Amino acid sequence: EDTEADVPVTYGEMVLNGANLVTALVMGKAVRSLDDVGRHLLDMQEE
Amino acid sequence: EDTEADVPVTYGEMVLNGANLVTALVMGKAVRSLDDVGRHLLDMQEE
Numbered sequence A, B: 001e002d003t004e005a006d007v008p009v010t011y012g013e014m015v016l017n018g019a020n021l022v023t024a025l026v027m028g029k030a031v032r033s034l035d036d037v038g039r040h041l042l043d044m045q046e047e
Helices: A019-026 A034-044 B019-026 B034-044
Strands: none
Touching: A019 A034, A019 B019, A019 B034, A034 B019, B019 B034
8 A cells, every 4th residue: 555545636628719619610620729729830930 | 885994903812811821721721701700700699
């Protein structure tokens, strides 16, 4: 026995909100954290 | 034969920027004025 005790956590979560909602019902697709992916792709060509 | 002239225009250009650049790369889908279409769709579900 290391220990009868432990430290569990609570459920994650996600939704289609800002740009994920638009594309889902317009382009028909969606991505985890499109805001992030979008920020990092655009910024990446600004160095 | 009527007046030879015309009130002719120039050319209209459409570019990939911002939202539809990210989605064109990530989702491979491009759409016209996605920024405008996105505005209204996020609008019309709010009073």
